[PDB]
């Protein structure tokens, strides 16, 4: 409950659709469930993914990467997850220490660009990995999986779900 | 009802989704810091600390007893897992029959029979597992909390990065 | 008689026509193995591997230029990012249908004739998605990291050299692009 | 002068002492590039790469033996799983302290003498974790998948060959191991 609220608020302000991350985790767990001979669990998980994805298009809109360049199919790609990619040499120098101090202050005060620039110029690189989900295609995949599960076609449902996981596109973007 | 559905499913899969959630809190905290959202980073790291503070008895259900590799002397919890699958994707009657047989076996909860049947037909299926050192992740999160309080955001980010790097990847057969 | 192994030549010729600088992938694998070697108590192997990375990266800028992603949008530092590795990302539902069977045959015939766009579009319309994952290496920063690691190794600072090399690996940016 | 590149030799000699079959890594990179080539409408290149993989994998069973993980626990199929690639997994907090600095110096001294165990223990007890991620390739099954792909390519079944190769790649099992 607490975690769910905390993650939703944080993700909302990061423009990340945690609801999509959760649908994909349901999918992941469904495939696991199948191969543990837990088809009832797999149904509950796939039905939950369906329910999450069924949130209306207007609600997904603020999370859509409208300028997404690498699409596997013509769809609206939603930023469903993201993470920090970071590189430095891990050797302390006074220039780096000063740069970190400056960047910390700038982050505390909301000067994101100044923080990132300051770190960059000191040899500390930081960007965002993004995970992009095709909204209508993933909806389709989950529905197809539901039907296969109803038919007892577990292995086949597992592969449709794998397909849905393989449709998540990885991208990188600068933080600003 | 996602929280409930995931908990019930993960409990019977011997996966500590509470651990996965703590790790996602950590992941989001690092993001938050670099978007100039220190109050959010605090909320997220405090939530990670709360989840991790669950008692040792509750974590024990999910502790891996056969881990061949550990970085630190600690209890490693299976906090996440996923299916690793390999086949040739060329349909044959022999494979299709094996699949039908496996499906029948899974319907009745016969995991071993299902996995053996698929393996004999050239369809491989095992588990990837993600292992979290319990006390070391507790320690890293507390350390990060203190650094955030001190305004040492970049440093807290690296402590959290180390916590993420402490997740050990493993594989195991489904049987 | 089957082709004899000629891996360096085969990869180079193939990667050149794919706009992938396999020389960069080779430099990064050297780096990877150097870190492994350090933690096996093999400093000499680590030196040889890091020196090899340095030699590969020292290839002149003109030679790297055709592999630079000049429109790279996610950069950690201001640098020339080289496409050093790439792989196929593929998604389909694995359910055969007549429409997919026909589309796959058609795509195969198009690829036979080098009609990449037609093939990818045909697969796409049948629900078969295919794009490229790319691995982008900052040329000057990686040169710098490798040189720095060489100096640390000379000083016997093996753990530190390991972390510099780790940072070099962490400098590799992951991107995706449509195949056409 | 600086060491000129001799990448295949340097990688082989290092991997041999590390018990990593780089020949396997090379075959898998050939397979990866072959899939890439197919989707660029380069079937001739895909053939050369797949043929090179076949040639590398055709190395005799005796030669693969020193790299077989005899006690592999997570097999997809009954096969000899070869350690074909490995990398360092490392975790620390990146906060310098006198205790960690001392431990790092001590670890470096121990690694200088080839004392892997002492070094790794020393780091571990200072809160620096270091293990190996290993990549395990089923030898017979991978040979089989490459031959099968070769036939499909001869038949112009490019998409299908791609998926057989994808399955070969999905047959690589990832494990972790203690350095020592
Ligand atoms: Zn200083
Ligand atoms: Zn962002
Ligand atoms: Zn399990
Ligand atoms: Zn076990
Ligand atoms: Zn039957
Ligand atoms: Zn293991
Ligand atoms: Zn390309
Ligand atoms: Zn991009
Ligand atoms: Zn000191
Ligand atoms: Zn080793």
Are A141 and A122 members of one domain? no
Under 8 Å between Cβ of D113 and B108 = no
Mutation target vs B (from D31, D69, D72, D74; most B CBs, 10 A cutoff): D74
Q: How many residues does chain D have?
A: 180
Backbone phi, psi, residue C44, to 5°:
-65, -50
Backbone phi, psi, residue C155, to 5°:
-80, 0
Residue D170 to residues A167, C104, D28: CA-CA distances in angstroms?
16, 22, 11
Domain count, chain A: 2
Q: Kindly report the CATH number assigned to the domain that includes residue D88.
A: 6.10.250.2140
Q: Does C179 touch chain A (CB under 8 A)?
A: no
* Separation of alpha carbons A27 and A21, rounded Å: 10
Sequence-ordered list of residues with C-beta below 8 angstroms from that of C125, at least 6 positions apart, any chain: C103
DSSP B35-97: TT-HHHHHHHHHHHHHHHTS-HHHHHTTB-S--S--SSSSPEEEEEEEEEEE------HHHHH
Q: Does A52 touch chain B (CB under 8 A)?
A: yes
* Separation of alpha carbons B54 and B60, rounded Å: 11
Neighbours of ion ligand 4 (CB under 5 A): B 66
Are C113 and C147 members of one domain? no
Taking an 8 Å cut-off on Cβ atoms, the answer to whether D76 and B162 are in contact is: no
Are C12 and C74 members of one domain? yes
3-state secondary structure C112-141: HCCCHHHHHHHHHHCCCEEEEEEEEEEHHH
Q: What is the CA radius of gyration of chain D?
A: 20
Sequence-ordered list of residues with C-beta below 8 angstroms from that of A20, at least 6 positions apart, any chain: A52, A53, A63, A78, A80, A81, A133
Q: Kindly report the CATH number assigned to the domain that includes residue C166.
A: 1.20.120.1940
Considering only CA atoms, which of A77, A37, A48, A50 is closest in space to residue A173? A77
Backbone phi, psi, residue C130, to 5°:
-145, 120
Chain C CB contacts of D111 under 8 Å are 38-39, 41, 43, 158-159
* Separation of alpha carbons B68 and B135, rounded Å: 18
Dig out the tokens for D124 from the structure.
Answer: 């571990």
Q: Does D11 touch chain C (CB under 8 A)?
A: yes
Residue D150 to residues A28, B151, C42: CA-CA distances in angstroms?
33, 59, 39
* Separation of alpha carbons C12 and B169, rounded Å: 33
Are C76 and C159 members of one domain? yes
Considering only CA atoms, which of D115, D127, D100, D136 is closest in space to residue D179? D115
* Separation of alpha carbons B65 and B77, rounded Å: 9
- Domain hosting C56: range is 1-83+138-171
Helices (H), A14-134: 18-35, 39-53, 57-60, 94-108, 112-121
* Separation of alpha carbons C145 and D51, rounded Å: 36
In this structure, what is the dihedral angle of CA atoms D18, D22, D25, D31, given to the nearest 10 degrees?
A: -170
Considering only CA atoms, which of A174, A150, A168, A132 is closest in space to residue A28? A168
Taking an 8 Å cut-off on Cβ atoms, the answer to whether B90 and D160 are in contact is: yes
Q: What is the CA radius of gyration of chain C?
A: 20
* Separation of alpha carbons D152 and D163, rounded Å: 10
Considering only CA atoms, which of B164, B171, B165, B175 is closest in space to residue B24? B164
* Separation of alpha carbons B151 and B142, rounded Å: 14
Method: X-ray
Sign of CA dihedral C52, C55, C58, C62: negative
What is the CA angle A81-A85-A89, rounded to 5? Answer: 165
* Separation of alpha carbons D142 and D148, rounded Å: 10
Query: At B164, which helix (H) or strand (E)?
Result: helix B153-165
Are B106 and B174 members of one domain? yes
Are A30 and A61 members of one domain? yes
Are A36 and A65 members of one domain? yes
Sign of CA dihedral A141, A143, A149, A153: negative
* Separation of alpha carbons D148 and D38, rounded Å: 16
Are C61 and C8 members of one domain? yes
Under 8 Å between Cβ of A118 and A102 = yes
Under 8 Å between Cβ of A107 and B152 = no
Backbone phi, psi, residue C89, to 5°:
-105, 125
Asked if residue C177 belongs to a known ligand binding site, the reply is yes
Asked if residue D101 belongs to a known ligand binding site, the reply is yes
Residue A165 to residues A68, A123, B121, B130, C112: CA-CA distances in angstroms?
18, 35, 24, 18, 29
Are A57 and A72 members of one domain? yes
Are D77 and D162 members of one domain? yes
CA contacts within 13 A on the Cβ side of B159: 23
Are D93 and D158 members of one domain? no
Pairs of residues, one from chain B and one from chain D, whose beta carbons lie less than 8 Å apart: 107
Are B109 and B175 members of one domain? yes
Under 8 Å between Cβ of C77 and A120 = yes
Segment 21-50 of chain A within 8 Å of chain B by CB: 21-22, 25-26, 28-29, 31-39, 41, 44-45, 48
Sequence-ordered list of residues with C-beta below 8 angstroms from that of D62, at least 6 positions apart, any chain: none
* Separation of alpha carbons B105 and D46, rounded Å: 40
Kind of pairing between the strands at D129-138 and C81-91: unpaired
DSSP D53-95: HHHHHTS-HHHHGGGB-TT----SSSS-EEEEEEEEEEE----
């Amino acid at each position: 409950a607490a975690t769910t609220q905390v993650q939703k608020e944080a993700a909302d302000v990061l423009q990340v659709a945690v609801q999509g991350a959760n649908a994909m985790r349901d999918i992941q767990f469904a495939r696991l469930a199948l191969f543990h001979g837990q088809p009832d669990s797999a149904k509950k998980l796939t039905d939950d993914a369906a329910a999450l994805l069924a949130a209306d298009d207007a609600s997904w809109a603020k999370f859509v990467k409208t300028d997404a360049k690498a699409k596997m199919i013509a769809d609206r790609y939603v930023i469903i997850n993201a993470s920090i990619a970071l590189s430095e040499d891990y050797v302390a120098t006074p220039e780096k220490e000063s740069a970190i101090q400056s960047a910390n202050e700038k982050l505390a005060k909301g000067d994101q660009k100044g923080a990132i620039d300051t770190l960059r110029l000191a040899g500390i690189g930081v960007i965002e990995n993004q995970y992009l989900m095709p909204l209508n295609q993933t909806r389709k995949a989950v529905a197809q999986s539901q039907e296969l599960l109803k038919a007892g076609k577990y292995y086949e449902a597992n592969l449709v779900l794998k397909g849905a996981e393989e449709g998540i596109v990885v991208d990188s973007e600068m933080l600003v």
